Design an enzyme around this catalytic site. Structure first.
Site, PDB file in Angstrom:
ATOM      1  N   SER A   1      28.186  16.766  48.528  1.00 14.80           N
ATOM      2  CA  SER A   1      28.042  17.888  49.307  1.00 14.80           C
ATOM      3  C   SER A   1      29.046  18.348  49.906  1.00 14.80           C
ATOM      4  O   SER A   1      30.040  17.505  50.581  1.00 14.80           O
ATOM      5  CB  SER A   1      26.649  18.103  50.415  1.00 14.80           C
ATOM      6  OG  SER A   1      26.973  18.887  51.364  1.00 14.80           O
ATOM      7  N   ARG A   2      29.771  19.657  49.136  1.00 15.42           N
ATOM      8  CA  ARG A   2      30.738  19.850  49.381  1.00 15.42           C
ATOM      9  C   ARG A   2      31.432  20.739  50.558  1.00 15.42           C
ATOM     10  O   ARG A   2      32.152  20.355  51.124  1.00 15.42           O
ATOM     11  CB  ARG A   2      31.159  21.018  48.401  1.00 15.42           C
ATOM     12  CG  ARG A   2      32.412  20.253  46.535  1.00 15.42           C
ATOM     13  CD  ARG A   2      32.435  21.113  46.318  1.00 15.42           C
ATOM     14  NE  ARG A   2      31.496  21.882  44.811  1.00 15.42           N
ATOM     15  CZ  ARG A   2      31.317  21.008  44.203  1.00 15.42           C
ATOM     16  NH1 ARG A   2      31.694  19.386  44.407  1.00 15.42           N
ATOM     17  NH2 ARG A   2      30.160  21.160  42.909  1.00 15.42           N
ATOM     18  N   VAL A   3      30.698  21.079  51.625  1.00 15.30           N
ATOM     19  CA  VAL A   3      30.272  21.707  52.911  1.00 15.30           C
ATOM     20  C   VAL A   3      30.810  20.514  53.648  1.00 15.30           C
ATOM     21  O   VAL A   3      32.075  20.025  54.574  1.00 15.30           O
ATOM     22  CB  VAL A   3      29.273  22.289  53.088  1.00 15.30           C
ATOM     23  CG1 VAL A   3      29.747  22.415  54.497  1.00 15.30           C
ATOM     24  CG2 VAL A   3      28.789  23.911  52.206  1.00 15.30           C
ATOM     25  N   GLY A   4      30.461  19.307  53.605  1.00 11.72           N
ATOM     26  CA  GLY A   4      30.644  18.279  54.406  1.00 11.72           C
ATOM     27  C   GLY A   4      30.442  18.603  55.618  1.00 11.72           C
ATOM     28  O   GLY A   4      29.411  17.924  55.921  1.00 11.72           O
TER      29      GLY A   4
END
Ligand SMILES: Nc1ncnc2c1ncn2[C@@H]1O[C@H](COP(=O)(O)OP(=O)(O)OP(=O)(O)O)[C@@H](O)[C@H]1O
Ligand SMILES: [Mg+2]
Lengths: 288, 52, 367, 116, 52, 73, 116, 73
Positions: free
Chosen positions: H8-11
């Protein structure tokens, strides 16, 4: 060309590569264990050598039959091996050495008899023929001395009748953490083991022998030979562990190479399949 | 026990008899195919004579 | 009966079935078809052999070989060679099937062998592409399946009512049939191609021939792992049906653990005995060419294998053992052999006679 | 290549050679991941014999002496059959495999082995 | 038992010789049968060639 | 230069007699050496013939090396 | 196969049977190489129960009427649930595996085992 | 859920404070368990350190299982 089959094969090879790394992990630990177990057998042999040397030097009247070199007509071999393979070329090199030594003894017109320890030796010298006297199987990693008294007792009993004149011990030597060397050493005609000790530094006291010195000397010699055989087996166990570690590392490297080849083949096939599909689609579209 | 030994030594007689039997069978079986091909080629040369 | 100890015991073929012969080039497909034609000397079923896209020298050699064995007295050869127009190579199988069907509709039995249906498919592809019809996968026309289906579906077995109706009461008693043996060739064992996938779907089985098995000495190279026959046991005589179970299970067991074949030194005793028996049964299935076995020879060999009479002979000498045993039975026990061949029965008397003969052979013959 | 044309002996020799080469081709995969020492003794013997067979098929042609330099050889059929029969019988198990490379009949193999 | 031994030795040797006679007589008889059968096969084959 | 796959179908006719007669089966020597070294990576016996061939192939391989802009004669 | 639609005991029995079968399928290579003696005390029960389960899936077909004996069984689902719960639990662990072959409910396998 | 490749690149910025703080132990436990999962089959000569890591990893793996229609706040 069923690319999913190739993907599954690559996944399985990569899994086996992980499998072997852990086996190497374990083999290193057992090599350490056997290596430190070899050390605990030293003081017993040291004390026995000291006592035997002092007893034999202080009472030089008679020579026991295990300390005198009589002419040779038959020799003997105690061959220790592993129970399962997948440990380098340990057993193969050891058996090549013993076979060459036996062939060298053949021209002297002296025949040989054997006493085998470990499954691999049992099979190899059952197929080889020869004159077997005893066999032992499923020794394990930490053998009890009771498991080894059979072969040494048979060999010594054959020696006492005049049937045998020498009894060689055939095993592997632990050079370092990664190298092992075969060894062929005689034990029953006890080579003087640093008998020069306790002649300049000997004192003017002897023991008080509860039995007559002859019986005591015989009892000492039998146990000393048995301890030599035991601590020669333990070193072979350590060598086997090191060889298995090395073999597992080599297998991991070879699997890693197989992966790098199959990846190239898979990529080539994927591009070829895409090209064929596009060509067929374009042809079918242009024909309508 | 040496009588038992003579029993052993007769066994070899059976083995020799069996091998001799097979040798006879093979050496005279081969003659059959000899005869077969001889009749084939005789028919063949007769075929050329008759086709002439 | 085809005459092969492997086919007749593990992939049986009935009258009216359609059995496929599929495998790579130069593995013995044509040899199997010709042996099947030759073995029909006494069954009294007429044969038809159709050659499609073959150079005329091979057709002439096949015809001469059929004439040497006397099997041409009841065979018809349809030849559409490689220089013939595409229309002839497209039409040849149908015109062979009609000649075959002549016998089916009149109470008699027939057997037709289409050679290289792949070449018929290629000829039809050439014809369709030149007519500007749209291609499909691998540039084949869309209706190749319908081309092969209406050809293979004609091979069948008809009831006595149909043949009685067709001949207006002349052939009342009997029933007809027609058997087919289409032959396909695959590229590098790729059975996922178009034409082989179409043909496998239609036929009632297949017989895979492997190159790796052919080189290794196993001839014929029949692959038992993936060869099936949907008719199954109902297409076998009583004795062979009763006996083939041991062969099938021995090969199954030997094939489950073939991955460890080179590691027999490091195994328990049970699996080592399984390997010992599987190797011997595999060695048993080898057979020469142009020499088919009657059902009695197969029965004797299979029974001798089942009851462990081969367990004490080394693997390298099994073929000689089998040949000598069959010759010994042909010599000593002619009445029993004819009893088995004529009918196919299997009673306690027959089993006792076979066992007594095998024991006397092992005792007194020394192959 | 059938017994009725070339004879029984030649056919048997050819089939045995092909069988040995096929078994070596099948073993070639195990000896890569595992070692050569995991095999039984028969398999090791087959591997050595198969390498010797592969070497023995090499030959200096009469027209290829420009590329290499060695003169060409012309081997009669009887010499080939006799050499391969011996090689399959195991008579030449004591000859190193480098002596079977770029030679004519079986006599050159023995001569080259002795020279080594 | 010593006296019994030689009697059993002879009773084995004679049986071995009887086996010798029987099987060696069987083998060549089978060979002659095979020769005759091959001759009949050739007889069948030659006339087939001529009729063709 | 991969000595395994590289040829000159003109052959020895394209060089002066010195190099023509000196360079024999050097290329084939390296071609066999490559395969032998690949097959005998794990050989624990190494009989004297194979050991000599492997000790010569490395000499020949290391022999043929030179730097950019360094023409020999 | 969902606990909401088939209840909870059905789903749990099915899951347990699947786990036993797919562990026995994994033990195959080890059984073939070593044998049954060197396995742990656990995973021997798994082998025996998996063999019993494989046998107990056998069924006589009514329409056959030949070689079987017209044996229409049509066992109720409750009988199979009871039987497999007992077999997994171990109440039937002492019965020879040849009894579980070609029968219907557990009453029939009990009767067959007692007869032999 | 395959935790190895899922991403998940939002993190972190898409989590509440408590879960953002507590997720590190779960992530590192799954990483360590996935690194040395091969050892789970031997379970004989495992040293003290790696056995603890295996024990924690298997327990966390067992923790993540969940039924249907039963969400956790
Ligand atoms: N049982 C056997 N024993 C010995 N040789 C055999 C046996 N079966 C087949 N062969 C040989 O296999 C060789 C090659 O196979 P075959 O002649 O049958 O061609 P094919 O399979 O039809 O292939 P293609 O269609 O490419 O011509 C033949 O020359 C034949 O002698
Ligand atoms: Mg063909």
């Amino acid at each position: 060309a069923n690319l999913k089959e190739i993907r599954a094969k690559v996944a399985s090879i990569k899994s086996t590569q992980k499998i072997t790394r852990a086996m190497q992990m374990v083999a290193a630990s057992k090599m350490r264990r056997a290596q430190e177990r070899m050390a605990q057998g030293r003081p017993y042999a040291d004390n026995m050598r000291r006592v035997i040397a002092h007893l034999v030097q202080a009472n030089p009247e008679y020579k026991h039959r295990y300390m005198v070199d009589r002419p040779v007509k038959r020799v003997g071999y105690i061959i220790v091996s592993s129970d399962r393979g997948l440990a380098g070329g340990l057993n193969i090199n050891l058996f090549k050495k013993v076979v060459q030594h036996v062939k060298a003894q053949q021209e002297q017109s002296i025949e040989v008899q054997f006493a085998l320890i470990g499954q691999k030796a049992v099979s190899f010298f059952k197929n080889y023929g020869g004159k077997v006297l005893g066999a032992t199987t499923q020794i394990g990693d930490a053998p009890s001395l009771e498991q080894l008294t059979g072969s040494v007792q048979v060999m010594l009993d054959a020696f006492d009748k005049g049937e045998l004149d020498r009894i060689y011990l055939v095993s592997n030597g632990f050079v370092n953490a990664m190298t092992q060397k075969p060894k062929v050493e005689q034990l029953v005609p006890l080579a003087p083991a640093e008998e020069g000790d306790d002649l300049n530094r000997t004192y003017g006291w002897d023991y008080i022998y509860e039995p007559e010195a002859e019986e005591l000397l015989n009892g000492l010699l039998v146990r000393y030979i048995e301890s030599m055989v035991y601590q020669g087996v333990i070193e072979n166990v350590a060598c086997e562990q090191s060889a298995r570690m090395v073999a597992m590392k080599a297998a991991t490297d070879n699997a890693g190479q197989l992966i790098k080849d199959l990846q190239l083949i898979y990529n080539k096939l994927r591009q070829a399949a895409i090209t064929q599909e596009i060509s067929e689609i374009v042809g079918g579209a242009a024909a309508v | 026990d040496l009588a038992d030994a003579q029993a052993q030594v007769k066994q070899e007689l059976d083995a020799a008899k069996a091998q001799a039997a097979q040798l006879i069978e093979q050496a005279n079986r081969r003659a059959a195919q000899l005869i077969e091909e001889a009749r084939t080629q005789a028919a063949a040369e007769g075929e050329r004579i008759r086709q002439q | 009966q085809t005459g092969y100890k492997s086919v007749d015991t593990m992939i049986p073929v009935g009258r009216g079935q359609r059995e496929l012969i599929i495998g790579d080039r130069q593995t013995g497909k044509t040899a199997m078809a010709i042996d099947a034609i030759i073995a029909q000397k006494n069954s009294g079923i007429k044969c038809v052999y159709v050659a499609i896209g073959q150079k005329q020298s091979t057709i002439a050699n096949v015809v001469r070989k059929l004439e040497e064995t006397g099997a041409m007295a009841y065979t018809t050869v349809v030849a559409a060679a490689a220089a013939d127009p595409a229309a002839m190579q497209y039409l040849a199988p149908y015109s062979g099937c009609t000649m075959g069907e002549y016998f089916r509709d009149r109470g008699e039995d027939a057997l037709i062998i289409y050679d290289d249906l792949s070449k018929q498919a290629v000829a039809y592809r050439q014809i369709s592409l030149l007519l500007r019809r749209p291609p499909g996968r691998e540039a084949y026309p869309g209706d190749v399946f319908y081309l092969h289906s209406r050809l293979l579906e004609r091979a069948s077995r008809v009831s006595a009512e149909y043949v009685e109706k067709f001949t207006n009461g002349a052939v009342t008693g009997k029933t007809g049939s027609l058997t087919a043996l289409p032959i396909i060739e695959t590229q590098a064992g790729d059975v996922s191609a178009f034409v082989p996938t179409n043909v496998i779907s239609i036929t009632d089985g297949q017989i895979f021939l492997e190159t790796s098995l052919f080189n290794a000495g196993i001839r014929p190279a029949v692959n038992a792992g993936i060869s099936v026959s949907r008719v199954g046991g109902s297409a076998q005589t009583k004795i062979i049906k009763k006996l083939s179970g041991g062969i099938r299970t021995a090969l199954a067991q030997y094939r489950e653990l073939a991955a460890f074949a080179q590691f027999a030194s490091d195994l328990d005793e049970a699996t080592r005995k399984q390997l010992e028996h599987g190797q011997r049964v595999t060695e048993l299935m080898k057979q020469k060419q142009y020499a088919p076995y009657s059902i009695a020879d197969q029965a004797v060999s299979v029974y001798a294998s089942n009851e462990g009479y081969m367990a004490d002979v080394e693997v390298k000498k099994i073929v000689d053992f089998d040949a000598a045993l069959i010759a010994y039975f042909r010599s000593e026990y002619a009445p029993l052999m004819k009893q088995i061949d004529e009918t196919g029965d299997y009673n306690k008397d027959i089993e006792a006679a076979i066992k007594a003969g095998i024991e006397s052979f092992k005792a007194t013959q020394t192959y | 290549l059938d017994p009725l044309v070339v004879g029984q002996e030649h056919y048997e020799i050819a089939r045995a050679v092909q069988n040995v080469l096929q078994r070596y081709k099948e073993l070639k995969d195990i000896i890569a991941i595992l070692g050569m020492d995991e095999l039984a003794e028969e398999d090791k013997l087959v591997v050595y014999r198969a390498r010797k067979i592969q070497r023995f098929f090499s030959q200096p042609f009469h027209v290829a002496e420009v590329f290499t330099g060695a003169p060409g050889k012309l081997v009669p059929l009887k010499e080939t059959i006799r050499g391969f029969k011996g090689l399959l019988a195991g008579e030449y198990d004591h000859i190193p495999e480098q002596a079977f490379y770029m030679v004519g009949g079986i006599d050159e193999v023995i001569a080259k082995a002795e020279k080594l």
